[PDB]
Design a binder for these strands. Structure first.
Ligand SMILES: [Mg+2]
Ligand SMILES: [Mg+2]
Ligand SMILES: [Mg+2]
Ligand SMILES: [Mg+2]
Ligand SMILES: [Mg+2]
Ligand SMILES: [Mg+2]
Ligand SMILES: [Mg+2]
Ligand SMILES: [Mg+2]
Ligand SMILES: [Mg+2]
Ligand SMILES: [Mg+2]
Ligand SMILES: [Mg+2]
Ligand SMILES: [Mg+2]
Ligand SMILES: [Mg+2]
Ligand SMILES: [Mg+2]
Ligand SMILES: [Mg+2]
Ligand SMILES: [Mg+2]
Ligand SMILES: [Mg+2]
Ligand SMILES: [Mg+2]
Ligand SMILES: [Mg+2]
Ligand SMILES: [Mg+2]
Ligand SMILES: [Mg+2]
Ligand SMILES: [Mg+2]
Ligand SMILES: [Mg+2]
Ligand SMILES: [Mg+2]
Ligand SMILES: [Mg+2]
Ligand SMILES: [Mg+2]
Ligand SMILES: [Mg+2]
Ligand SMILES: [Mg+2]
Ligand SMILES: [Mg+2]
Ligand SMILES: [Mg+2]
Ligand SMILES: [Mg+2]
Ligand SMILES: [Mg+2]
Ligand SMILES: [Mg+2]
Ligand SMILES: [Mg+2]
Ligand SMILES: [Mg+2]
Ligand SMILES: [Mg+2]
Ligand SMILES: [Mg+2]
Ligand SMILES: [Mg+2]
Ligand SMILES: [Mg+2]
Ligand SMILES: [Mg+2]
Ligand SMILES: [Mg+2]
Ligand SMILES: [Mg+2]
Ligand SMILES: [Mg+2]
Ligand SMILES: [Mg+2]
Ligand SMILES: [Mg+2]
Ligand SMILES: [Mg+2]
Ligand SMILES: [Mg+2]
Ligand SMILES: [Mg+2]
Ligand SMILES: [Mg+2]
Ligand SMILES: [Mg+2]
Ligand SMILES: [Mg+2]
Ligand SMILES: [Mg+2]
Ligand SMILES: [Mg+2]
Ligand SMILES: [Mg+2]
Ligand SMILES: [Mg+2]
Ligand SMILES: [Mg+2]
Ligand SMILES: [Mg+2]
Ligand SMILES: [Mg+2]
Ligand SMILES: [Mg+2]
Ligand SMILES: [Mg+2]
Ligand SMILES: [Mg+2]
Ligand SMILES: [Mg+2]
Ligand SMILES: [Mg+2]
Ligand SMILES: [Mg+2]
Ligand SMILES: [Mg+2]
Ligand SMILES: [Mg+2]
Ligand SMILES: [Mg+2]
Ligand SMILES: [Mg+2]
Ligand SMILES: [Mg+2]
Ligand SMILES: [Mg+2]
Ligand SMILES: [Mg+2]
Ligand SMILES: [Mg+2]
Ligand SMILES: [Mg+2]
Ligand SMILES: [Mg+2]
Ligand SMILES: [Mg+2]
Ligand SMILES: [Mg+2]
Ligand SMILES: [Mg+2]
Ligand SMILES: [Mg+2]
Ligand SMILES: [Mg+2]
Ligand SMILES: [Mg+2]
Ligand SMILES: [Mg+2]
Ligand SMILES: [Mg+2]
Ligand SMILES: [Mg+2]
Ligand SMILES: [Mg+2]
Ligand SMILES: [Mg+2]
Ligand SMILES: [Mg+2]
Ligand SMILES: [Mg+2]
Ligand SMILES: [Mg+2]
Ligand SMILES: [Mg+2]
Ligand SMILES: [Mg+2]
Ligand SMILES: [Mg+2]
Ligand SMILES: [Mg+2]
Ligand SMILES: [Mg+2]
Ligand SMILES: [Mg+2]
Ligand SMILES: [Mg+2]
Ligand SMILES: [Mg+2]
Ligand SMILES: [Mg+2]
Ligand SMILES: [Mg+2]
Ligand SMILES: [Mg+2]
Ligand SMILES: [Mg+2]
Ligand SMILES: [Mg+2]
Ligand SMILES: [Mg+2]
Ligand SMILES: [Mg+2]
Ligand SMILES: [Mg+2]
Ligand SMILES: [Mg+2]
Lengths: 117, 59, 138, 155, 113, 101
RNA sequence: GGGGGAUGACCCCAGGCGGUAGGGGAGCGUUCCCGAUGCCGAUGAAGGCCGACCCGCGAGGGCGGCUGGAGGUAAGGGAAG
RNA sequence: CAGGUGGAGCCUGGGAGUGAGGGCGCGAGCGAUAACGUCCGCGUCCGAGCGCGGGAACAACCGAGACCGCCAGCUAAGGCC
RNA sequence: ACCGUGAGGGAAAGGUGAAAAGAACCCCGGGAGGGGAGUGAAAUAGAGCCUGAAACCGUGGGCUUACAAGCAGUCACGGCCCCGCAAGGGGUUGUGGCGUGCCUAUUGAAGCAUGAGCCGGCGACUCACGGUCGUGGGCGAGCUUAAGCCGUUGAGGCGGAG
């Protein structure tokens, strides 16, 4: 029996061409240029997922180091404050608190410098 | 076949961009003195076009 | 819990003196001000920063022999079109450039980097249009 | 193969400076319409399965049928004189209602003629007993003059 | 209610004729006629015929009134190309393709109150 | 009045009547859970150390889940190296009922 | 790997899991054969075009809509252009 | 003679690929106490970690061996106008 | 067919429908072609005819773009358009962060080293007979037949030379 290519090849090409929807020029029209692009996008996403974690923390910090600079304070010290203050809270992420709950942040600033001043 | 040659196939984008000036302009027409039909200016409008100069009469 | 992101907020205006202030030291601050990194709702992708006005821009102090030794260069696309300009001449010819240039180079590069520079009105000596506010500072 | 194809053995172009690729004759498998690499040729799929194994399997195949009671020896039938309607009549009185496939093993020529055409009957001679036919058919129905031969086959 | 004509397999290169068609898309059949008349392009001849056929089709087939119809939609598609050998220097031989057009003119009725 | 809870090495701002997704929990969709772990009171002043020893917040498991699949792929050029893996992060959906201060 | 005698494909617990040349192990799909005098099919086969849905790590398998208009072929196996 | 249960060791066998290495450190020869030179030795990394952080950018210098997910935390080199 | 003086080389090219019922007549046109009418279950089955993928070319619509710079993606946010009661999702992209094509060959390639215009189809670890291991079974001091002979709905058996 002879098993011709048949229908199989067109299908694999369709699968990838669909993942390449919206890409520029041929990168979305040619199976080859599409597959090359997907390789790229595959590693970017993966690397960028690991560094999305970075880019946010970075943001949180800048946000914080500004709200407590309003209360005369280095971010660097503020953090040391909470470290010794026992306050293992903040979770830096939770400094929308510093933006949504200013009074609640201010009180933390106090407990902050309260220890090690 | 010979010396200088294109190094890369020009994209659909860049060729059509070249065409951005290939658009046509419709003929400048004016209503005709006698006949109602439209004809281009300063030409003996093709239906008895003038008066003093022979109007290549369709009459 | 998504991180908070500010809406159109407030177009702030701030006034600075310059006279006697070093230069880079002042530039540092004016930059951080330009991109509201003092505001606790700082956002890198938006431009929610203060508009900065600066007066007495020509009485910017500066250490060492920088009046003679420090040179600003400019390359025209042409051959030998690299021009060299010393601080002295700049100040004497076009102050407010010496400081504008120190800030341009301290704002980030990009379409947003620009624009932030646009939000910076440097003037020779005192005076300027006082349409908006101007909470002067140090 | 590229040697059995119809085309000439001539080299298609010089080999250098032609600016084209690089070829010999168009009977090569790279060419459309060229020979076929490692395609099939006629071949004998048979082999000599150990006889001691053929027996065993034939035995066990019957056993398995008996072990589930789907096996049946019968005598002379009565519905002979090769006519399907006649057999079909006998079959009824015997339990075989064509609700399950039957492998009818008998030496009697006429009984086979009679059953042959039933879409639920595969009929076979006694010296023709093979295991494949046993395992396809649900019920196994032999006569005594056919159980004897099958009996002497094994052992 | 619209009316269309279609010239198929017209021996002309689409790119060429598509240029005069763009000259009349959306125009009142009255302009469309005056424009083609005085457009200096082989393409006009063919488009005129299609446009005119589409007009006739409107009146004598769909009831529309030669006085309220405009070029609603229009387009030319590429039909199968006539391949031809062009003898070339040093024995070369190229193929020019005489291309083919499928001209479509569809007519609508002007909202005329 | 809000609270700052910690479930699954992550801290969230829980309001009453709030639907929250969290790392998959060991509590069948019926059960109700207080995460005896709290970090901050909404009317403030109450913060102290890691966890406030008194407070806890009650939430009901609304059901476990599996998040939309992210395709995590790996490719090393010029070495013929490709890997494709599908991933869905199992979660649990909670409703925040009472903030026991 | 060690447990809990479900003995697997279950729950525990603890560890390993970058990778070319290569070794090894499991699977997916294509054509054909047994399964077929069967089963699916005009209330629509194969193929085609969509899909934000379902299942699988993945190769893939579903399911639904449109097209198409006469074939297709389970479970379990077998052979390869 | 002891510790050391390790993707340790040993024995018999099936399958290999490699037999073009390269940078760096240290020890020599050749060279000019030249070479991104060359030839050995002992180590290491790149090779195959052109994955991640630092070094402006940079296979082999510093940090560190990437199973998967997290809008959590501590750190390494290196840094904190 | 075509190529070659010649020996010789040597292709492409199948499919309407069940049935021509293969579209009378009318309109535009010189025709071609098309528009109605009509046939058909179907006419994007209309004879450049089954299905009709991809490259490729168009028309229309949504989003988007003229002070920004790049392996074209990716991660974030935000706008505008669409779906949905809903929360959610789909589309597009303004800004910000990150970012040196694929294959090959190499000590080392984004590499200014090889190959590739793009798409579709064809395209390369085989088979026989021996051998050597492993493995699933049969029988075990034994194991096994070859050619042939008989039989045969694709039925097996016999055959002991070796
Ligand atoms: Mg076939
Ligand atoms: Mg193939
Ligand atoms: Mg998109
Ligand atoms: Mg980290
Ligand atoms: Mg801390
Ligand atoms: Mg275009
Ligand atoms: Mg031959
Ligand atoms: Mg021949
Ligand atoms: Mg030959
Ligand atoms: Mg020869
Ligand atoms: Mg070439
Ligand atoms: Mg041929
Ligand atoms: Mg052939
Ligand atoms: Mg074999
Ligand atoms: Mg044989
Ligand atoms: Mg034989
Ligand atoms: Mg029968
Ligand atoms: Mg000649
Ligand atoms: Mg107290
Ligand atoms: Mg690379
Ligand atoms: Mg390599
Ligand atoms: Mg066990
Ligand atoms: Mg584990
Ligand atoms: Mg591995
Ligand atoms: Mg293994
Ligand atoms: Mg399979
Ligand atoms: Mg059959
Ligand atoms: Mg039925
Ligand atoms: Mg019907
Ligand atoms: Mg249907
Ligand atoms: Mg088939
Ligand atoms: Mg599918
Ligand atoms: Mg279908
Ligand atoms: Mg239909
Ligand atoms: Mg089948
Ligand atoms: Mg199939
Ligand atoms: Mg099968
Ligand atoms: Mg093959
Ligand atoms: Mg010992
Ligand atoms: Mg080992
Ligand atoms: Mg060994
Ligand atoms: Mg060996
Ligand atoms: Mg050698
Ligand atoms: Mg050597
Ligand atoms: Mg060496
Ligand atoms: Mg070495
Ligand atoms: Mg070495
Ligand atoms: Mg180096
Ligand atoms: Mg040293
Ligand atoms: Mg040296
Ligand atoms: Mg060297
Ligand atoms: Mg070392
Ligand atoms: Mg190598
Ligand atoms: Mg490295
Ligand atoms: Mg290593
Ligand atoms: Mg590099
Ligand atoms: Mg790097
Ligand atoms: Mg670096
Ligand atoms: Mg690095
Ligand atoms: Mg590891
Ligand atoms: Mg790890
Ligand atoms: Mg720290
Ligand atoms: Mg340190
Ligand atoms: Mg530095
Ligand atoms: Mg001739
Ligand atoms: Mg001749
Ligand atoms: Mg055809
Ligand atoms: Mg026919
Ligand atoms: Mg037929
Ligand atoms: Mg006429
Ligand atoms: Mg007609
Ligand atoms: Mg009709
Ligand atoms: Mg009808
Ligand atoms: Mg129809
Ligand atoms: Mg028609
Ligand atoms: Mg159709
Ligand atoms: Mg057609
Ligand atoms: Mg049809
Ligand atoms: Mg055709
Ligand atoms: Mg048919
Ligand atoms: Mg067709
Ligand atoms: Mg368009
Ligand atoms: Mg500018
Ligand atoms: Mg702009
Ligand atoms: Mg440009
Ligand atoms: Mg980009
Ligand atoms: Mg968006
Ligand atoms: Mg959205
Ligand atoms: Mg950018
Ligand atoms: Mg970007
Ligand atoms: Mg960058
Ligand atoms: Mg080479
Ligand atoms: Mg080389
Ligand atoms: Mg070399
Ligand atoms: Mg290049
Ligand atoms: Mg070269
Ligand atoms: Mg190249
Ligand atoms: Mg070479
Ligand atoms: Mg290559
Ligand atoms: Mg080339
Ligand atoms: Mg070419
Ligand atoms: Mg292909
Ligand atoms: Mg063999
Ligand atoms: Mg063997
Ligand atoms: Mg005979």
């Amino acid at each position: 029996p002879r098993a011709k290519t048949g229908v199989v090849r067109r299908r694999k090409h369709k699968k990838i061409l669909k993942l390449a929807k919206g890409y520029w020029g041929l990168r979305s029209k040619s199976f080859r240029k599409a597959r090359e692009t997907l390789f790229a996008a595959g590693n970017y996403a993966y690397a960028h997922r690991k560094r999305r974690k970075r880019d946010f923390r970075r943001l949180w910090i800048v946000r914080i180091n500004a709200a407590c600079r309003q209360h005369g304070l280095n971010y660097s010290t503020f953090i040391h404050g909470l470290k010794k203050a026992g306050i293992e809270v903040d979770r830096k992420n939770l400094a929308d608190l510093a933006v949504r709950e200013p009074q609640v942040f201010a009180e933390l600033v106090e407990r902050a410098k309260a220890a090690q001043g | 076949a010979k010396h200088p040659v294109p190094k890369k196939k020009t994209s659909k984008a860049r060729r059509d961009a070249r065409r951005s000036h290939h658009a046509l302009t419709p003929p400048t027409l004016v209503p005709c003195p006698e006949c109602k039909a439209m004809k281009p200016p300063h030409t003996v409008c093709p239906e008895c076009g003038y008066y003093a100069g022979r109007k290549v009469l369709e009459v | 819990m998504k991180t908070y992101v500010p809406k159109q907020v407030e177009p702030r205006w701030v006034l600075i003196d310059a006279e006697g202030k070093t230069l880079g030291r002042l530039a540092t601050k004016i930059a951080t001000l330009l991109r509201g990194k003092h505001r606790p709702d700082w956002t890198p992708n938006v431009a929610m920063g203060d508009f900065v006005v600066v007066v007495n821009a020509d009485k910017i102090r500066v250490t060492g022999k920088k009046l003679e030794q420090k040179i600003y260069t400019r390359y025209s696309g042409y051959p030998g079109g690299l021009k060299k300009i010393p601080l002295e001449k700049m100040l004497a010819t076009h102050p407010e450039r010496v400081l504008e240039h120190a800030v341009k180079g301290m704002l980030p590069k990009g379409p947003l980097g620009r624009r932030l520079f646009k939000r910076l009105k440097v003037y020779a000596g005192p005076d300027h249009p006082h349409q908006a506010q101007r909470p002067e500072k140090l | 193969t590229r040697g059995e194809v119809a085309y000439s053995g001539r080299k298609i172009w010089p080999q250098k400076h032609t600016g084209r690729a690089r070829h010999g004759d168009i009977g090569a498998p790279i060419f459309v319409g060229g020979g076929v690499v490692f395609g099939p040729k006629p071949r004998d799929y048979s082999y000599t399965l150990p006889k001691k194994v053929r027996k065993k399997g034939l035995a066990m195949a019957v056993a398995d049928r008996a072990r589930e009671g789907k096996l049946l020896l019968v005598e002379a039938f009565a519905g002979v004189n090769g006519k399907t309607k006649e057999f079909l009549a006998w079959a009824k009185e015997a339990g075989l209602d064509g609700s399950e496939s039957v492998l009818l093993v008998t030496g009697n020529e006429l009984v086979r003629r009679a059953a042959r055409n039933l879409p639920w009957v595969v009929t076979l001679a006694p010296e023709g007993l093979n295991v494949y036919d046993i395992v396809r058919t649900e019920r196994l129905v032999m006569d005594l003059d056919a159980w004897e031969v099958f009996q002497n086959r094994i052992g | 209610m619209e009316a269309k004509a279609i010239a198929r397999y017209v021996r002309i290169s689409p790119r060429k004729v598509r240029l005069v068609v763009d000259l009349i898309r959306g125009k009142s059949l009255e302009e469309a006629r005056n424009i083609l008349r005085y457009t200096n392009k082989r393409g006009a001849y063919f488009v005129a015929k299609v446009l005119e056929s589409a007009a006739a089709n409107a009146v004598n087939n769909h009831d529309m009134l030669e006085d309220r119809l405009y070029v609603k939609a229009a387009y030319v598609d590429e039909g199968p190309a006539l391949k031809r050998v062009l003898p070339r220097a040093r024995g070369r031989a190229d193929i020019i393709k005489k291309r083919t057009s499928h001209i479509t003119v569809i007519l609508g009725e002007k909202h005329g109150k | 009045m809000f609270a700052i809870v910690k479930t699954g090495g992550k801290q969230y701002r829980v309001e009453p009547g709030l639907k929250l997704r969290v790392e998959k929990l060991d509590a069948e969709p019926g059960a109700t859970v207080e995460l005896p772990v709290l970090l901050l009171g909404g009317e403030k002043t109450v913060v102290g150390t890691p966890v406030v020893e008194g407070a806890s917040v009650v939430a009901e498991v609304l059901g476990h889940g599996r998040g939309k699949k992210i395709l995590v792929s790996k490719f090393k050029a010029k070495v013929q190296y490709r890997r494709k893996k599908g991933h869905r992060q199992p979660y649990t959906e909670l409703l925040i009922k009472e903030i026991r201060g």
